[PDB]
Amino acid sequence: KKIFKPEELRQALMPTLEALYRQDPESLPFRQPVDPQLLGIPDYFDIVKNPMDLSTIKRKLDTGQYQEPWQYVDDVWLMFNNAWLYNRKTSRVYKFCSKLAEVFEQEIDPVMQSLG
Numbered sequence: 085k086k087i088f089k090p091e092e093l094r095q096a097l098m099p100t101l102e103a104l105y106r107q108d109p110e111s112l113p114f115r116q117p118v119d120p121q122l123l124g125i126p127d128y129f130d131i132v133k134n135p136m137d138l139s140t141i142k143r144k145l146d147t148g149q150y151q152e153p154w155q156y157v158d159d160v161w162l163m164f165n166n167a168w169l170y171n172r173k174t175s176r177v178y179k180f181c182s183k184l185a186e187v188f189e190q191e192i193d194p195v196m197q198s199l200g
């Protein structure tokens with residue numbers, strides 16, 4: 085307690101996710117799960133033990149898998165930290181991740197205040 089209904093969390097938090105999706109080209113590496121099979125990077129899951137991406141976060145909101153808002157924030161940051169862990173600092177993915185984190189920080193704060 086506080087108790088959050090899945091519908092309130094979705095209503096309040098989805099705009100913050102949409103803000104990330106709206107970033108182009110910066111969201112593009114983040115819209116679906118990393119496929120180490122396709123990209124030929126079999127070490128990806130050795131390095132990244134808990135993968136996360138926007139599609140997965142959107143599904144969790146959509147299907148009521150978050151009980152409290154910090155679980156959502158933690159997944160967003162997991163996505164960021166996975167990308168900064170794995171990718172070189174000159175890479176598109178890395179630079180795009182840094183942009184997404186700037187955008188997210190701005191959106192998430194007033195939302196998290198309201199939700200309490």
Ligand SMILES: CCC(=O)N1CCOc2c(cc(-c3ccc(OC)c(OC)c3)cc2OC[C@@H]2CCCN(C)C2)C1
Pocket residue numbers: 109112113114118119123125166167170171175176177
């Ligand atoms: C969070 C994503 C991630 O950490 N990856 C794990 C790392 O692999 C990649 C990955 C994605 C991209 C990438 C880039 C640009 C895109 O649109 C503009 C895009 O759209 C789908 C994807 C690039 C990746 O790597 C591209 C090459 C792969 C071969 C080595 N080289 C250094 C980078 C996946």
